[PDB]
A paper describes a structure:
Another unicellular pappalysin is the T. forsythia KLIKK MP mirolysin, which protects the bacterium against complement-mediated bactericidal activity. As part of its virulence factor armamentarium, at the site of colonization it secretes mirolysin, a metallopeptidase of the unicellular pappalysin family, as a zymogen that is proteolytically auto-activated extracellularly at the Ser54–Arg55 bond. The catalytic domain conforms to the metzincin clan of metallopeptidases and contains a double calcium site, which acts as a calcium switch for activity.
A variant, in which the general base/acid Glu225 was replaced with alanine (E225A), lacked activity. This variant was used to obtain the intact zymogen for structural studies. Previously, this strategy has proven successful for other MP zymogens. We obtained two different crystal forms for native and selenomethionine-derivatized promirolysin E225A, which contained one and two protomers per asymmetric unit and diffracted to resolutions of 1.4 and 1.6 Å, respectively. Crystal structures of the catalytically impaired promirolysin point mutant E225A at 1.4 and 1.6 Å revealed that latency is exerted by an N-terminal 34-residue pro-segment that shields the front surface of the 274-residue catalytic domain, thus preventing substrate access. Tyrosine-switch Tyr286 pinches the extended segment I together with the upper-rim-strand segment Leu181–Tyr183 of the CD. In the capital interaction for latency, downstream Cys23 Sγ binds the catalytic zinc at 2.11–2.22 Å in the different structures, which is closer than typical Zn–S distances (2.31 Å), and contributes together with the three histidine ligands to a tetrahedral zinc coordination sphere [Figs. 2(c) and 2(d)]. Finally, the primary activation site Ser54–Arg55 is access­ible, and Arg55 protrudes from the molecular surface by virtue of a hydrogen bond between Arg55 N and Asp308 Oδ2.
Residue numbers in the entry: 21 to 327
Amino acid sequence: RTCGSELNMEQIRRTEPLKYQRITDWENQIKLHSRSVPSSTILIPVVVHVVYNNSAQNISDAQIISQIQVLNEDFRRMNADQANTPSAFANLAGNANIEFKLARRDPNGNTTNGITRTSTSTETFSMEMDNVKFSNLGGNNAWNTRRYLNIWVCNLGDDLLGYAQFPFEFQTKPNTDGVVIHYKHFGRDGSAESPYDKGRTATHAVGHWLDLRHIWGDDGGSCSGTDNIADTPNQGGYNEGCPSFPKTDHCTNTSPGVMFMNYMDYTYDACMNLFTKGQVERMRSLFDTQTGIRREMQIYANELTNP
Ligand SMILES: [Ca+2]
Ligand SMILES: [Ca+2]
Ligand SMILES: [Zn+2]
């Protein structure tokens, strides 16, 4: 799996010192800014922006609805492959109690189905430029990011599957908040290409938009990096493909080993099947009713997801 949302803290400390300070401040303050976390279902209004240069990139409404179905399964532990979670880890599995619905009202109060379509001359979008998120750069401007989760679907090229913007970046980069997914790996079955054809590229990206990090700590295989989640076993490097349970490494050398079936690893879509309770706590904390950075999204979520 390829992803543009790695946080190699050793590298960031040297290459991006202001970003290092911002991430460290966010983590020092995350416990003090998560007391009024909601006890009820969190609803996320979604807008999907299809940005296409050709017919293959202009994916079907059914393809998009299947992706929303997958998010609602994975974030509510309603994925049928939950049964595949090894019994040693199933007791750590979390139910995020987060729902996703396509928007029915656009930012001007007009009816919408929550899908936009933008033809473009851009052949390939760049994560570096964030050009898919700007109408003037060949993409499509975000819908009010305080109220909608914006998911852009486009051609990210031969390598990149998707990328997300993290919550610590919301204050300074509000208009680029959201997630971008490669069109070939959006939705389940249908036009999606194996082995990333079960909609988990977006489950993984939405996990980053909800403050989660790669489970192995983005540290080049060492045991020094962390995902800041105590119930995800310390893990060396990423896993790819479809490992066999149990898989141990130099960070967790005893069975049950590393949680390679966590959505925040780099494994194939069909071999992923859980978030942990600790990851759920972190994601839900962003909706703390008094100080949660994404709390406003809950104020008008019902209004925006009904006709
Ligand atoms: Ca961990
Ligand atoms: Ca590691
Ligand atoms: Zn990632």
